[PDB]
Structure 1
Amino acid sequence: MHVEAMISKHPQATDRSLVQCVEMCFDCAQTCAACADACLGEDKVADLRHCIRLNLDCAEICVAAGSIASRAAGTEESILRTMLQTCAEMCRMCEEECRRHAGNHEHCRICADVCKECETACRSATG
């Protein structure tokens, strides 16, 4: 990724927790998109419906969060903290469902691990 390089060159600019969060949002978005599709292709797709939905929700929220986190927030009201908290909660929910399938589907194991890491990164960027 070029998150770190680009933050340093912004005219309103270092912030390690923010860089980690942005990087994880884009990684998690892709991973969740891929997991949704993999689950879709499984013989057992009917057992994976909720996992697919959560993965699609998570991909969408992660892209939004990572994009908003790439912008200057100002010092008055901004959505960044709220959005990162939403992302953390979405990643927590998606992790839980992927994790339940992790013994049966390797793609769900990987996605659960990425969601856990993205949750941690988003929650850490809020403090």
Structure 2
Amino acid sequence: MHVEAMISKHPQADRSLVQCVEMCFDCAQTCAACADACLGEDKVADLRHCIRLNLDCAEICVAAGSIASRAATEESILRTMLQTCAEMCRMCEEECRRHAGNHEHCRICADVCKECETACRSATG
């Protein structure tokens, strides 16, 4: 990623923010991937809620990552958006974690959602 390099060259120019943007995009891709993998499993009927939560988590994480990319002093929705993203990731983590013993893709995704949750919460500080 080029998050850190772009922040330093912004004419209005933060480690917690860089980590948050990086994680949001990582987590968006991972959740989109996890949903698709779940859709290809024999046992897809057991993964409906997981697929749905991953789709919502991918959407929210892209939005949050985009918003945060534009947050390098003026009033912003950033802190509200990051709280919502943290809650989304917490929910998605919980469901992916439940399937992690059965599907390796869900273990990887649950780990990324946990990290993203932490990153987004830390950037609200």
Q: TM-score range by the shorter chain?
A: over 0.9
With normalisation by structure 1, the TM-score equals 0.96
Gaps of 5+ in 1: none
* Offset of residue 77 of structure 1: 3.5
The superposition leaves residues 29-68 of structure 1 with CA deviations (integer Å, 9 ceiling, x where unpaired) of: 0000000000000000000000000000000000000000
Contact 2:27 2:116 in 1 (8 A): yes
- Answer yes or no: is 1:76 the counterpart of 2:74: yes
> How far apart in 2 are the matches of 1:76 and 1:102?
41
Contact 1:12 1:72 in 2 (8 A): no
* SS in structure 1 at match of 2:102: coil
* Offset of residue 27 of structure 1: 0.2
Contact 2:71 2:78 in 1 (8 A): no
The superposition leaves residues 74-105 of structure 1 with CA deviations (integer Å, 9 ceiling, x where unpaired) of: x4532000000000000000000000000000
Contact 1:38 1:107 in 2 (8 A): yes
Query: What percentage of aligned pairs have identical amino acids?
Result: 100
Gaps of 5+ in 2: none
> How far apart in 1 are the matches of 2:74 and 2:15?
22
Contact 2:38 2:47 in 1 (8 A): yes
Contact 1:26 1:66 in 2 (8 A): yes
- Aligned-residue CA RMSD (Å): 1.0
**Paired residues, what number?**
125
> How far apart in 2 are the matches of 1:4 and 1:53?
32
> How far apart in 2 are the matches of 1:82 and 1:111?
24
* Offset of residue 72 of structure 1: 3.4
> How far apart in 1 are the matches of 2:71 and 2:110?
30
